[PDB]
Amino acid sequence: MKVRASVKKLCRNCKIIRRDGIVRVICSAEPRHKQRQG
Amino acid sequence: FIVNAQVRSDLGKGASRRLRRNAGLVPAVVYGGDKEPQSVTLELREIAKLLENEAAFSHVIALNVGGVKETVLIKALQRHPAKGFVMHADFLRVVADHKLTAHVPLHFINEEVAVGVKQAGGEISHTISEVEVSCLPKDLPEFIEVDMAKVELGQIVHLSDLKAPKGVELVQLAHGNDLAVANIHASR
């Protein structure tokens, strides 16, 4: 995870999810583009 | 080009602000040298779709207040300076025997085939569009052609260097103000 105040889709495989009230990003390619809240 | 209009029997500041924020309307006036001025309400959504057109300001606009229809040229426009939308519209009567100055855009046709661009490295700098003209309503230029094909690097096209289409008086040329229209110059 990577905690910001501004999560973005860093590449094309990134996907933004509201999970449990948190704006997370899941990446199917690289787990370094996983990022927590924003 | 047609807009629908109304009668507007109530004038002032707080009246105009209520038109803009409650009724969704836009004030306006219609005037010419031959009739009394008439205040008019219009719709912001219905005039903002005219302002989307490129040939909006240099064109006959039919305007229907009641069952009475007038020919109308938009000669003024007010606009909210921050957000940007029309407040009062302020347009002009059109008669067939009248001098009728309007603003006409410049249109800058073939800029890829420019001998100061292809061979010599340079870019086109339009310093001016929206030239004001002086013309009868029979000839309304929706556009004015600006040919930028036979112009070299470092060279400047002025108001004398282009065409006046069939009895159109470019206003600044009728003074000693030969303005610079476009420009070809070296890059940075």
């Binding site: - | 302002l51 606009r79 909210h80 300076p81 921050a82 957000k83 940007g84 870019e123 086109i124 700098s125 339009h126 310093t127 569009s129 890059s187 940075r188």
Partner: protein
Amino acid sequence: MLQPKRTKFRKQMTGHNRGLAHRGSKVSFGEYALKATSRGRLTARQIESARRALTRHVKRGGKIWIRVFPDKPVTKKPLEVRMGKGKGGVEYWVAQIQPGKVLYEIEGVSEELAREAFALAAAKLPLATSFVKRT
């Protein structure tokens, strides 16, 4: 930074920043522009920082007009200084910004490159800005 070459006086008052920007609100030289939508204050190194962001993100050509000009001098009392011993001396310069003031203008680029260049420009400025085209 942008400073005047010389001014008639050295210190102004504080003053106020009221009204909308009726003058300075049109894209008068370029095709695309960065208009402010909130009032504030640009401090002549904000102005140069957004300027360098623009001139570095273009990379190819264009012509950039910087429309705002800081002519208002702003003073400062230094630290460990009791108040009221004469007005403090000038430190920097400031353009007073109203809603509607066109800040920067560009021609010669595409609309997409202009938009993502004024995004870089707006990232460095303490104002709320927007993107406008030539009317």
